[model samples]
Target: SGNLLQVLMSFPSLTNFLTEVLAYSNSSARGRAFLEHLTDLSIRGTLFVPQNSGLGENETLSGRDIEHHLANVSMFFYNDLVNGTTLQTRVGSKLLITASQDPLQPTETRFVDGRAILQWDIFASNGIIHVISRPLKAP
Candidate 1:
């Protein structure tokens, strides 16, 4: 929710972008689920990865820093939703993430970052938690 809100706030003109790319799609269910995943951040605050932390490893940082990082990096890139075995998509620099239900497992997606790294785990309701090696670019 927070990431989506950030993107919405930053790119007001992208309302159509969200509707076209995420709101109405072959995978609208997954898209809605992805939006739902971000509700926590919207309510509590943003979630961000810390500086120097690799893509997958977890680390500790100040809460303010986390929020700042989320504001900086959240949805910095946008892409068209792609159809795959699961509903999938890419962001900046070919960073891909996918959402699907395995035969035995529940639905899930892996959010990746540039530089070939798995940045976070995305679920239906809970928002993503990522690790940033450095702070995102500020405006």
Candidate 2:
């Protein structure tokens, strides 16, 4: 029923992230436009959203670097992810993908730019969302 922005808002896990982005949006045109584009139903892409705890206390992010989290040009689903698959963010930064599997575990852990994907494939009307272990370092 909603897009990525609204879907993320509905997640209790992303409250801290929402707080950061929402506040950033009010400060400048880029941040405001980023949020607006995220809310648009036509904006299709893969968004890597970090969970609340991943944000850490006293940590903050602002400016155009925030665009590093969204690859607004293409949509990627969980099943399409594979080792060494690199995704490009809206900010023009590249996010590398890798996978690690424990010998005794049945499932593999996927990482994006070294950040583990905690939960993924959360469907949004406009795109998909994958929660990472932490925010990607702004490049």
Candidate 3:
């Protein structure tokens, strides 16, 4: 597996979100720290990363709030997600997997939290990253 930071840096589209929004925002030091935490080789989970434009400029959508939405899991792959599969986040929130369809594109799994996985199975040495359509909100 590749390192999460290296994987993110290799893709310009993904890097833009990490550097320009998640880590670069004025009030997102905690979010940056959370991201750095994911880089650790010992941590393993699934990261649902929203697109830069999808994360609106708002306190609730950035900073430490964003960290609350990331989940911790051993291994999460699109094929392993069935309807109603729930994943618990670091902040104790539960992310429910609503559906995993589209025979031509299995990676387009949808979450009950109103976000869709745009890209999936971005393997990393520490974990995995799934580029999502929107930011995951805290419950």
Candidate 4:
């Protein structure tokens, strides 16, 4: 709607993700800064929102683990992505886009780092968000 934070809060499916985000932000300075940036219209980024579907309402998360789902300073839509293209998140963790050897398979079945993208290209004033079926955890 207005910014990344507002857009994220707008989705009922993102409740669990949002809760874990609050958990992360409350515990770490980096996470707190990141959470504040979500509402700034100047901060453009890509955020993969973990759906509430498979997660518990009281899920716990660490800032480092949450960073794996955030790509800083870049917003990529599905059209700009190619199969097997690799991405580095804010934590320098790697994520891969697949499901398109480009000619044979349909592009509609896109997945990131093996987690199915349930919905995508959600627009906000600051960034774009993609709804993912599960959380992306960093080691």
Candidate 5:
């Protein structure tokens, strides 16, 4: 999808940073949690943007690419959940939801850029949250 390349081009530094963060053993848990959170947002039909970083004027992604990204994110969570790995919850124990496809109701999720996302619903009991690298778009 066009967005794949655009996302890569729009935030090479941020992507590199995330890759490095995920490379560490200690960061595996957090990295997985972040990916889980992204899946949750997608399943919940919430469109969000990357925080802190700003997107370029030409930055854009197709709905298909966005779906693919969400699918990969959900897969990450599915593997962990099926393997009985402990999830990193937020303030509340809110179980994060993951899906290979967009949820039933599509919500527009915007991001700040390529850094992280600032969401109002990050605080939940017995649940997890993630810092997405890119904003999610609804079709």
Candidate 6:
């Protein structure tokens, strides 16, 4: 297990999002400071990261939006992830992890909500990173 930065760096597709979107240096001082808190490696939580395609075509997320997304998506790591399990995010929002089945790929176990986890269980020293198909939002 490595730190959050190390884990995110391992995924090449996430490069743009990491550098252009999430990195504090790329944002304003206020934005940077806010992100610094959210991306703190010292804190333990699950990060539901959106894949390259998930960000939309040429769409950029503002600092405030990023903050909201971060708050609503991150949660303390829970070992018990069964179907219909409800997890509480840092912002006190509810995230639903549900079981799904793909007809063609019967061997695969699908977990989804508004966004599906394209890849799961990516362990980092600080927490876990789940690659989601879309950006999560607070409803």
The best candidate in terms of TM-score:
2
lDDT of 2 by residue, 1-139 (tens): 6888898899988887787788879988888988888888867989998887779647787655567889767789877888999888888788888976678876677899999888888898988999988888767
Backbone clashes, candidate 3: 1
* Reference-based lDDT, each prediction: 0.33, 0.83, 0.68, 0.83, 0.33, 0.63
lDDT of 1 by residue, 1-139 (tens): 3353343333333233233333322345644544454444543222333323332223332222222333223332213222231211221112233444457744343333322223443221223334334433222
The reply for model 1, stretches above 4 Å from the true place, is 1-3, 25-27, 42-139
TM for every model, in the order presented, reads: 0.25, 0.91, 0.75, 0.89, 0.23, 0.69
Between candidates 4 and 5, the one scoring higher on lDDT is: 4
lDDT of 3 at 34: 71
Candidate 2: stretches off by over 4 Å: 100-106
Listed per model in order, the count of residue pairs whose N, CA or C atoms clash below 3 Å is 2, 0, 1, 0, 21, 0
Candidate 2, residue 94: lDDT: 88
In TM-score terms, candidate 2 sits at: 0.91
Cα misplacement distance, residue 101 of candidate 6 (Å): 5.7
Residue 116 C-alpha lDDT in model 4: 88
lDDT of 1 at 103: 70
lDDT of 6 by residue, 20-100 (tens): 455545658866675565457767667777788777536666554454434233444434466787766645566777765
Considering only N, C-alpha and C atoms within 3 Å, which residue pairs clash in candidate 4?
none
Q: Mind giving the per-residue lDDT tens digits that candidate 4 earns over 1-139?
A: 6888888889988988888877777887997987887877777888998898867776677788788888775898888767887778888888889865457566557888889888879998898999998888886
Per-residue lDDT value at 64 in model 6:
49
Order the candidate numbers by lDDT, best to worst: 2, 4, 3, 6, 5, 1
Q: What 10-residue stretch in candidate 4 is worst by lDDT? A: 99-108
Q: Model 5 segments beyond 4 Å from truth? A: 1-49, 52-54, 71-129, 134-139
The better candidate by TM-score, 1 or 5, is: 1
lDDT against true structure, model 4? 0.83
- What is the Cα-based lDDT of residue 17 in candidate 6? 59
RMSD of 1: 15.2
Model 3 regions more than 4 Å off: 20-33, 56-60, 100-109
Model 3: lowest-lDDT 10 consecutive positions: 56-65
